[PDB]
Amino acid sequence: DPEFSWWEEKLTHNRLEVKTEAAAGVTTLAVDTDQAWACVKGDILMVESV
Amino acid sequence: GSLAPKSATRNPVKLNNFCQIFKKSYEITKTADATKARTGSALANDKKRR
Numbered sequence: 001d002p003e004f005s006w007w008e009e010k011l012t013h014n015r016l017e018v019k020t021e022a023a024a025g026v027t028t029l030a031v032d033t034d035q036a037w038a039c040v041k042g043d044i045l046m047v048e049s050v
Numbered sequence: 051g052s053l054a055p056k057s058a059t060r061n062p063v064k065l066n067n068f069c070q071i072f073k074k075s076y077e078i079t080k081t082a083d084a085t086k087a088r089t090g091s092a093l094a095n096d097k098k099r100r
Contacts, residue, residue: 007089011099
């Protein structure tokens with residue numbers, strides 16, 4: 001056919017990005033679109049640093 | 051011609067740790083299990099990812 005396609009997939013870390021500043025008290029975090037669907041109840045997350 | 055000296059001693063230090071519980075799961079409908087896909091069987095890929 002004049003057009004051809006193929007698929008790829010990556011196995012890597014599970015990183016999320018916080019879009020808006022969140023204070024110490026708040027318990028709801030705004031992240032990038034569709035990024036929250038990857039996490040479920042019981043997951044343990046850590047804040048990154050340089 | 052002196053008496054024996056008074057004695058002294060000391061103790062070790064203690065350390066401890068806990069045990070954690072880990073779980074990951076996968077799920078698929080039996081209809082989608084019996085369907086054909088170009089990328090392959092969905093159940094096997096999901097098991098690999100998890």
